[PDB]
Amino acid sequence: HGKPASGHKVRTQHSRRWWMQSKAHHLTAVPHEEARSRPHFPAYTEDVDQPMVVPDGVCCFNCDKPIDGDDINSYVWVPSGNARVPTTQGYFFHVKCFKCWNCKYRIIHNQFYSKDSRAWCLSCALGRDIRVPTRRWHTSYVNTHRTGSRLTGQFFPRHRHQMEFLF
Amino acid sequence: RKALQSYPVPPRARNYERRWSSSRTNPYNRMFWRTVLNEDFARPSFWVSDFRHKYLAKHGMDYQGRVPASPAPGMYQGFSDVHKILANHPKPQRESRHLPVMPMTPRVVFEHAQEKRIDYAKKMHRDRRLVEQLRTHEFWGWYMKLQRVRGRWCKEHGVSSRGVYGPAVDAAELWG
Amino acid sequence: KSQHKNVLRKGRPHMQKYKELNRWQREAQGITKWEQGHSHRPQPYVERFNPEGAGLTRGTSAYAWKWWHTQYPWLPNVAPADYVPPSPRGIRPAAWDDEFADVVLSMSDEEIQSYLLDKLTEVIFAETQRDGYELRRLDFEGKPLTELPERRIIENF
Amino acid sequence: WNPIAGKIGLVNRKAEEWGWPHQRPPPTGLRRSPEYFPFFFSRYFPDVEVRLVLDSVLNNETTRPIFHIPQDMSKQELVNYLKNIYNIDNVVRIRVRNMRGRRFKNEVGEIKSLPDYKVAVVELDSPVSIVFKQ
Amino acid sequence: TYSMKGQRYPAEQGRTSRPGSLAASRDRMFPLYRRNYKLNRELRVLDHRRISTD
Amino acid sequence: AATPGVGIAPETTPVKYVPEMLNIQNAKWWNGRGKPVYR
Amino acid sequence: NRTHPLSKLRGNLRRNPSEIPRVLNMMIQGVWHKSGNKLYFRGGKPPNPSTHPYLTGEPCPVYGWK
Amino acid sequence: NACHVPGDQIFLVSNSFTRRLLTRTDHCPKCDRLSTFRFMSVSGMVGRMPYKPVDTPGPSYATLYWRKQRSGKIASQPLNEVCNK
Amino acid sequence: VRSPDHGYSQHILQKDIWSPFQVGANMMSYTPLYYDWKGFSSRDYFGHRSGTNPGSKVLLGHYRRDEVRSWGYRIMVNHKPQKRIPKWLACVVHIPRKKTFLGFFLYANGAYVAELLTYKQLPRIIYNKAFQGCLPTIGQTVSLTEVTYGKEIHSVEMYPGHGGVICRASGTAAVVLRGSEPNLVPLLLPSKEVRLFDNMCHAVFGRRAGVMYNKQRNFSKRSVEENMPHRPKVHSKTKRVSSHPAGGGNGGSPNLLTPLDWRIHPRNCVKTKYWLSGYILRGRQYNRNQTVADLKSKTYSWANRDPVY
Amino acid sequence: FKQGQGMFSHQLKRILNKKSLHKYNWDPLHMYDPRKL
RNA sequence: GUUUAUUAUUUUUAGUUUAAUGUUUAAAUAUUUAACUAGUGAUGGCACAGUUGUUCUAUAUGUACCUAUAAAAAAUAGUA
RNA sequence: UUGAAUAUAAAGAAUUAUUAUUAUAAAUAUUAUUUUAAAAAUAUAAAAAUAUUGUUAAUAAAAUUAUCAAGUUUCAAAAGCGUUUAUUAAAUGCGUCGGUCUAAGUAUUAUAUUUAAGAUUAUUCUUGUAUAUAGAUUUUUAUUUUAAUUUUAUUAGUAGCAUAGUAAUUUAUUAACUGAUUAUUAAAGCGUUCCAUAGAAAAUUU
Ligand SMILES: [Zn+2]
Ligand SMILES: [Zn+2]
Ligand SMILES: [Zn+2]
């Protein structure tokens, strides 16, 4: 009868049922229990298999104006893992074309809804109607040039690259 | 502590409490899923959710259509700080037909003062590289003049720059 | 708790508040600290009000932001503060004319309020009521006990 | 600046406006009138010190000669002033600061702070200059 | 350069007219540090013009 | 925030507890702000 | 806005004991408008309301001042 | 271990050029000009860590798969040489 | 529809009362019916959070907070339905904090304003019209003359023409009692106290609404108890003996003999009736022990009102 | 962590001792206007 | 950031239930660290003041010992 | 500036100190304050064979790691997830229940409390406060408050349970002042009891 039966939740994060609920299920192979745990994602996704460069036939999804090739971070390049369909790589948007098309304000929490090749705000694109945010109206909080999208998607061992141990 | 009603826009990060909880960042991405998923969460924002109660009475039906946003001109004319008896929308208008104009509340003007100081920041960085794309870009262009003028000089003066030995130690292509 | 990090202070510091100024206004006036003669209560704000609130007695929608929730419904109807009393002046409607004026003016303003109430109960419970609804309670068989409505139903109509 | 009104400062005002303990006051109608002497000594005998700084108008040509004007000369008065007193007829923009008068410690030791003034960088059309022969 | 909150060293501020040296203003000793308030306003502050609605 | 220190008397008898009821000395020269009003 | 005696215009430079608490809070605090820019007093040398040029007229939207 | 606007390279970084590590400027051979490189991943260390073998940090599971493509399956060209001169 | 009221039960204990027909929140906040105000918390004159002085009926319950939320749904309620002009139940709105149901009635001369919603009412039906009978239709607002003995009525008005005050809470009903008085009708208020209501008073026929509130509404969620936010109600026996006479005691002291909130609330002592109306016949104390039915049997006259109280 | 030890708190404790102007404004006879007699 | 079918719910979590150092110390509470962390119900518009406010109650706090500060006394101290 | 007026660099911990003051806004400036030739302690630990708790009141919630930084399992005791100046069977909180209230708020309601949800049940009996009361006291127990000393029935019981103790038995350990089990007269637990029980504190195994 160790007495202080109500406690601090002292030992969470030191468990094996935890070690399986801390992983991330990203787009890699990394069978499981081998992905990173605390930050949830490995830094520096190496992509030597496919070079992951910005294309030349690139254009804004929302606006459609051609986008500067790579000399700049004026474009928000969302590579949705392996995308292919939006462009050779994923959706492309100049930082100022990254607003909801239908309601015309920012995409709150940056989750957008590609409505027929014009990014729509999830809430409007979902039917809801509350149509003005508080902080910054016509410009999202997003990072530029995939720098905010590299928390997820295609870490180094995409696919079964067993070429490494085989003869 | 600098009551939030003083800040032009209410602050982004909102510190709370909780002696037994230590984390600066407010947990967004949870305040987002609720609200997007549940319609009721956010008060109807009277107009877009009035205009029923005025269609039902005058038409005998549920409106059964998407309500127009941007409240009609003439609604909420006695209200002064609507901002809640609405969405964060502006006070709609007078009961006029003049082109819509934002009533320049102290808030709207501040947003103008952001979207100019956003264009200001993205402009001081966009060209700090544009000139960093000359300094290092032209330093290399000049450095190769150096290795050329060193390349020319190191042939007449014959300094092979490959050790005390003659090239006969090189031709082996060993270490030596 | 044995660690007071004291860094959670220092964020968003308070205004300076220069309390010597109110300390001065006391002396630069006859009054002491306003001893509990008031001591206070939290005064209302303009936001929490709802003008166009279908209460408010319809004269006060600005003066009623102040006044408690318990006292603004009762604030009384007074006037636009520029409306002058009904004045027994001689300006008769442009085309009402005499014969009608000579008759109507004979009736006094209880001799005409009375006529109006009868006519209005007659206008309602007439084309207005007999056209669809019914406005007088019916008996066993369903016969309209009273001739015309009761004076209350008309009042709230 | 101390906002609180002092009693004496009104009394010292009267004794020079009209001989206070001895000469009875002028009727309040005259005092509300532009014919009251300090409003009459002003509308006809102004008292201003629009001093010119020369360090900006010396041998180096300038389109923006700088002045100092008393703190209570607004812009459009500095126009009226140079126009009707110094014949200056080309002033498109005036640019006005306000400077805390110079301070220092005299050899004795009291901090003897000069009065404050108002830099007003006028901008003439055709530049002006001053020659200094040595 | 711009109208921003900043920290200046005191010698940088330049001293009053000393017996040893004239009044050395913060500008005439550091010319390229004089703030350019045209360049501030043009870039950083919101002009009456851009929001003039009536 | 404030305090009268006297404690609000009944709305009918507006004054109980004058400071004299306690044999108090309040000369203008003794504690300064003294001299009472019922006087 | 100090004003000239003759000028019918009314300014808020009062010196009544009931009004000096706010006339200092203009000279030392300054106003932080809810639009983000600090008003009447924004820097070091606090203004001298009694050495202002007199209030010449109310502002208009179209021009500056009527 | 460094890429490009469109290409790659490889290089072991010292301590002295730790500044240029994240994003370097270099002659991109799939072009003829200097172009900004990035740091797609690590490929070891520039020296030993105390008390540790030659490959203390180890290049990667990743930068190896980049190597196993460059050297890797050269079976297209053991012709013209294998390792000789 | 099954059971126009449901114990929806999101979590096995958390049972909130959803009603099919309930208007979605969008069709709730109506502009010229929405009142907002700060409620004083429990602060009364001089801040000073405090109840009411013993003798008064103006409540500032000490334990009250967040009475008006500020962006909570708050539409005002009619309480004065008009006598026999047909209604038209447009929708049925359900506010959690004001537990009442209330549905918007068109009322047939344009007045899209009427709320109190009697039990078994359906939306999009006309209500205030009588059938062949006197006025015996659910929802019909009936003068107390038109009711017969033994049938429930809700939102009875205490003084005729002064708005419905009695029996407004959900599922409640004042039962008529067939009194003998000349021009008065006694109603068995739900508090088991009978009251000589004037017969010309107006009541809305039927039960009140939203049955299954009496029980079956249980939050048990920290977020969901913000339908009723109130201050903490501390033990009176852990209150710094300098402060509250029940205090200290090195362990669990049971409590003092005579309980007291701050002044006194001894268990059945403090009964705070101080003025009884001329209409009151038997207070809840005079009936508290008999039954519900035995009070429905007798005929009530002025001689039944006990000359001493 | 108080705030404002600076000079404005060094004047506002010295200039406010200046005694404002006193004018014995005696009570206004609102309800009994004397000049309408 | 994230686990789960779930808008509830596991939880990235760099300022806070632990431990070391520090012990007139860089600190009249800081460095490193364990823990915890999801607040549509709250560091915060102004509001309550000293026989008293406030108290999810610990006789806790109401400006860096709540014995509030500040102010005015000649309280008593020969009864080791 | 084309606005009249107005004013634009600097804090707080006693300091030029621990110290990004996070209101905002993004994202490669080759922006620029840290003495020095040793071993003791000590702050501290890179490195490294065996051993795995024999250390100790007690190992295991105890910095970072590219060698990518995570112990598993059983049993007993233990509620809510909020909240606290020596931080918890502290005090909150939903429900039920008791009492109060139909001339300021809706008697399936809101005041005023006692408990604690969930699941089983909730026992025997009264001397005083309260209520009712009849000039008052004195008298007087439908419900409530507090009580039950042999209340002690249910129920768990050597338990945070006044000593008696390391309780006697059983296990467990080489060694059992541990802990768990059986029952069971427990110095005077006891129906708000008891069960169920998850991250806590113990006891094993590992
Ligand atoms: Zn674009
Ligand atoms: Zn949108
Ligand atoms: Zn390239």
Per residue, the 3-state secondary structure of D14-36, as one string, reads HHHHCCCCCCCCCCHHHHCCCCC
Q: With contact defined as beta carbons under 8 Å apart, do B45 and A130 qualify?
A: yes
Would you say how long chain D is, in residues?
Answer: 134
Q: Is H25 helix (H, G, I), strand (E, B) or coil?
A: strand
Which residues contact residue I277 at a Cβ distance below 8 angstroms, ignoring those fewer than 6 apart? I195
**C37 reaches F (C-beta below 8 A):** yes
Q: Determine whether I169 is exposed, middle or buried from the number of CB atoms within 10 Å of its CB (0-12, 13-18, 19+).
A: middle
Cα A120 from Cα A112, distance rounded (Å):
6
Q: Is A134 helix (H, G, I), strand (E, B) or coil?
A: coil
| Ligand 1 geometric centre to CA of A86 (Å) | 14
Query: How far does H65 lie from chain A, in Å, by closest CA?
Result: 6
Q: With contact defined as beta carbons under 8 Å apart, do G35 and B106 qualify?
A: yes
Mutation target for I interface from C133, C138, C143, C148: give the one with most I CBs within 10 A: C133
Long-range pairs for A98-105: beta carbons < 8 A, 24 or more residues apart = A98/A62, A98/A139, A98/A140, A98/A142, A99/A62, A99/A138, A99/A139, A99/A140, A100/A124, A100/A125, A101/A62, A103/A131, A103/B69, A104/A138, A105/A131, A105/A132, A105/A133, A105/A137, A105/A138
Instruction: Note whether H39 contacts A44, CB cutoff 8 Å.
Output: yes
Measured between beta carbons, the chain G residues lying within 8 angstroms of J5 are: none
Give the count of beta carbons closer than 10 Å to the beta carbon of residue E15: 14
Instruction: Note whether D1 contacts G49, CB cutoff 8 Å.
Output: yes
Phi and psi of I297, rounded to 5°? -85, -55
Instruction: Note whether F3 contacts C35, CB cutoff 8 Å.
Output: yes
How far: I227 CA to L174 C1' (Å)? 65
Q: With contact defined as beta carbons under 8 Å apart, do A102 and A119 qualify?
A: no
Tokens for C63, please give them.
Answer: 């003066």
| Ligand 2 geometric centre to CA of A60 (Å) | 18
Beta strand extents in D46-90 (DSSP E only): 51-52, 66-69
Cα I180 from Cα I177, distance rounded (Å):
10
Query: Which residue bears the tokens 């079964």?
Result: A160
Q: With contact defined as beta carbons under 8 Å apart, do H32 and H72 qualify?
A: no
Residue of chain G whose alpha carbon sits nearest to that of C15: G29
| Ligand 2 geometric centre to CA of A102 (Å) | 5
Query: Which residue bears the tokens 């004054």?
Result: F15
Closest-CA residue to A147 (of H22, I169, C101, C52): H22
Which residues contact residue C10 at a Cβ distance below 8 angstroms, ignoring those fewer than 6 apart? J1
Tokens for I211, please give them.
Answer: 């049955």
Instruction: Note whether E54 contacts G37, CB cutoff 8 Å.
Output: no
Which residues contact residue A96 at a Cβ distance below 8 angstroms, ignoring those fewer than 6 apart? A139
Cα A43 from Cα A41, distance rounded (Å):
7
How far: I56 CA to K47 C1' (Å)? 24
Q: With contact defined as beta carbons under 8 Å apart, do B111 and A137 qualify?
A: yes
Q: Determine whether H35 is exposed, middle or buried from the number of CB atoms within 10 Å of its CB (0-12, 13-18, 19+).
A: buried
Closest-CA residue to C50 (of I190, D15, I30): I30
Dihedral of CA atoms C147, C150, C151, C152 in degrees, nearest 10, equals -160
| Ligand 1 geometric centre to CA of H30 (Å) | 28
Q: Determine whether A67 is exposed, middle or buried from the number of CB atoms within 10 Å of its CB (0-12, 13-18, 19+).
A: buried
Q: With contact defined as beta carbons under 8 Å apart, do B102 and B90 qualify?
A: yes
Phi and psi of A121, rounded to 5°? -65, 140
Q: How far is residue I122 from each of residues A43, I8, I76, I102, measured CA to CA in Å?
A: 61, 19, 21, 12
Instruction: Tell me the Ramachandran region of residue A34: left when phi exceeds 0, alpha when psi lies from -120 to 50, beta otherwise.
Output: alpha
How far: A20 CA to L75 C1' (Å)? 26
Q: Which method was used? A: cryo-EM
Q: Quote the longest CA-to-CA distance of chain G.
A: 37
Name the closest ligand to CA A99.
2
Q: With contact defined as beta carbons under 8 Å apart, do D69 and D48 qualify?
A: yes
Q: Is A154 helix (H, G, I), strand (E, B) or coil?
A: coil
Query: How far does C33 lie from chain G, in Å, by closest CA?
Result: 14
CB burial string I1-18: b at 16+ within 10 A, e below = eeebbbeeeeeeeebbbe
**Residues 33..62 of A with a Cβ closer than 8 Å to B: which?**
none
Instruction: Note whether F5 contacts C38, CB cutoff 8 Å.
Output: no
Cα A53 from Cα C62, distance rounded (Å):
63
Closest-CA residue to B104 (of B118, B91, B115, B114): B91
Q: Is the CB of G1 under 7 A from strand L?
A: yes
Q: With contact defined as beta carbons under 8 Å apart, do C52 and C60 qualify?
A: no
Bridge-based pairing of strands D66-69 and D118-124 is antiparallel
Cα C63 from Cα C56, distance rounded (Å):
10
Residue of chain C whose alpha carbon sits nearest to that of B11: C12
Cα C63 from Cα C75, distance rounded (Å):
9
Cα B18 from Cα C8, distance rounded (Å):
12
Q: Is H28 helix (H, G, I), strand (E, B) or coil?
A: strand
Give the count of beta carbons closer than 10 Å to the beta carbon of residue A98: 26
- Under DSSP, the state recorded for C71 is T
**Which chain I residues 83-122 have CB under 7 A to strand L?**
98-100
Mark the nucleotides of strand L covered by protein, meaning any atom under 7 Å from a CB: 1-13, 18, 21-30, 46-48, 61-62, 66-73, 76-79, 81-85, 87-96, 98-115, 117-118, 128-133, 142-147, 159-160, 179-180, 198-202
Q: With contact defined as beta carbons under 8 Å apart, do D73 and D118 qualify?
A: yes
How far: I242 CA to K48 C1' (Å)? 21
Q: How many helices (H) and strands (E) does chain I have?
A: 2, 13
Closest-CA residue to I74 (of I115, I28, I34, I22): I34
Cα I156 from Cα I201, distance rounded (Å):
7
Resolution limit, Å: 3.6
Q: With contact defined as beta carbons under 8 Å apart, do I112 and I153 qualify?
A: no
Of B2, B19, B78, the CB nearest to C1: B19
One-letter amino acid at I115 equals E
Q: How many CA atoms lie within 13 A of B47 on its CB side?
A: 23
Nearest residue to nucleotide L90, by CA–C1' distance, is I238
Which residues does chain F break after (C to N > 2.5 Å)? none
**A108 reaches B (C-beta below 8 A):** yes
Residue of chain J whose alpha carbon sits nearest to that of C30: J22
Annotated binding site of A: 60, 63, 94, 97, 124
Cα E39 from Cα E32, distance rounded (Å):
14
One-letter amino acid at I133 equals G
Cα C71 from Cα C39, distance rounded (Å):
20
Query: How far does B39 lie from chain H, in Å, by closest CA?
Result: 44
Of G17, G24, G28, the CB nearest to J20: G17
Q: How far is residue I132 from each of residues I82, I136, I176, measured CA to CA in Å?
A: 20, 9, 22
Q: With contact defined as beta carbons under 8 Å apart, do A31 and A162 qualify?
A: no
Cα A61 from Cα B34, distance rounded (Å):
27
Give the count of beta carbons closer than 10 Å to the beta carbon of residue J23: 6
Instruction: Note whether H25 contacts B136, CB cutoff 8 Å.
Output: yes
Residue of chain H whose alpha carbon sits nearest to that of B172: H85
**Residues 118..137 of C with a Cβ closer than 8 Å to I: which?**
132-135, 137
Measured between beta carbons, the chain I residues lying within 8 angstroms of C152 are: 83, 161
Closest-CA residue to I209 (of I113, I159, I138): I138
Cα D74 from Cα G54, distance rounded (Å):
8
Residue of chain D whose alpha carbon sits nearest to that of J13: D2
Which residues contact residue A145 at a Cβ distance below 8 angstroms, ignoring those fewer than 6 apart? A73, A75, A76, A77
Give the count of beta carbons closer than 10 Å to the beta carbon of residue C5: 7
Query: Which residue bears the tokens 């690259």?
Result: A161
Which residues contact residue C98 at a Cβ distance below 8 angstroms, ignoring those fewer than 6 apart? none
Neighbours of ion ligand 2 (CB under 5 A): A 100, 102-103, 121, 124
Q: Is the CB of B133 under 7 A from strand L?
A: yes
Beta strand extents in D1-134 (DSSP E only): 51-52, 66-69, 91-96, 118-124
Distance from the Cα of residue H48 to its chain's centroid: 18
Measured between beta carbons, the chain J residues lying within 8 angstroms of D4 are: 15-16, 18-20
- Percentages of chain G per state (helix, strand, coil), in multiples of 5: 20, 5, 75
**Residues 40..99 of C with a Cβ closer than 8 Å to B: which?**
46-47, 50-52, 61
Q: Determine whether A57 is exposed, middle or buried from the number of CB atoms within 10 Å of its CB (0-12, 13-18, 19+).
A: exposed
Cα I295 from Cα I301, distance rounded (Å):
13
Measured between beta carbons, the chain B residues lying within 8 angstroms of C51 are: 78-79
How far: B47 CA to L122 C1' (Å)? 56
How far: H58 CA to L34 C1' (Å)? 36
CB burial string I267-285: b at 16+ within 10 A, e below = eeeeeeeeeeeeebbbbee
Mark the nucleotides of strand K covered by protein, meaning any atom under 7 Å from a CB: 1-4, 6-19, 29-60, 63, 72
H/E segment holding residue I253: none
Phi and psi of I283, rounded to 5°? -65, 175
Residue of chain J whose alpha carbon sits nearest to that of D9: J21
H/E segment holding residue C113: helix C113-123
Instruction: Tell me the Ramachandran region of residue I79: left when phi exceeds 0, alpha when psi lies from -120 to 50, beta otherwise.
Output: left
Which residues contact residue B35 at a Cβ distance below 8 angstroms, ignoring those fewer than 6 apart? A123, A130, B41, B42
Cα H40 from Cα H30, distance rounded (Å):
17
Using CA of residue G23, residue G25, residue G26, residue G32, what is the dihedral sign? negative
Instruction: Tell me the Ramachandran region of residue A153: left when phi exceeds 0, alpha when psi lies from -120 to 50, beta otherwise.
Output: left
Cα H6 from Cα G57, distance rounded (Å):
65
Residue of chain G whose alpha carbon sits nearest to that of E51: G61
Closest-CA residue to I26 (of D104, G13, B64): B64
Cα C110 from Cα C117, distance rounded (Å):
11
Give the count of beta carbons closer than 10 Å to the beta carbon of residue F25: 9
Cα I184 from Cα I172, distance rounded (Å):
22
How far: F25 CA to K73 C1' (Å)? 12
Q: With contact defined as beta carbons under 8 Å apart, do B113 and G35 qualify?
A: yes
Dihedral of CA atoms I272, I278, I282, I286 in degrees, nearest 10, equals 30
Long-range pairs for I248-252: beta carbons < 8 A, 24 or more residues apart = none
- Under DSSP, the state recorded for B46 is H
Instruction: Tell me the Ramachandran region of residue A145: left when phi exceeds 0, alpha when psi lies from -120 to 50, beta otherwise.
Output: left
Query: Which residue bears the tokens 């009964």?
Result: I271
Closest-CA residue to C67 (of C52, C50, C45): C45
Nucleotide lying nearest to A7, CA to C1' measure: L200
Q: Determine whether D62 is exposed, middle or buried from the number of CB atoms within 10 Å of its CB (0-12, 13-18, 19+).
A: middle
Query: Which residue bears the tokens 């952001």?
Result: B114
Closest-CA residue to G37 (of A134, C11, B113): B113
- Looking at the DSSP bridge assignments, the partners of residue I22 are I92
Measured between beta carbons, the chain G residues lying within 8 angstroms of C25 are: 17-18, 20-21
- Looking at the DSSP bridge assignments, the partners of residue D128 are D62
Cα I186 from Cα I177, distance rounded (Å):
5
**J15 reaches D (C-beta below 8 A):** yes
Cα B115 from Cα I294, distance rounded (Å):
77
Nearest residue to nucleotide L128, by CA–C1' distance, is I257
Cα C50 from Cα B79, distance rounded (Å):
7
Using CA of residue C113, residue C114, residue C115, residue C118, what is the dihedral sign? positive
Cα H46 from Cα H9, distance rounded (Å):
17
Give the count of beta carbons closer than 10 Å to the beta carbon of residue D66: 17
Would you say how long chain A is, in residues?
Answer: 167
CA angle I172, I174, I176 (to 5 degrees): 150
Distance from the Cα of residue I48 to its chain's centroid: 28
Q: Is the CB of I172 under 7 A from strand L?
A: yes
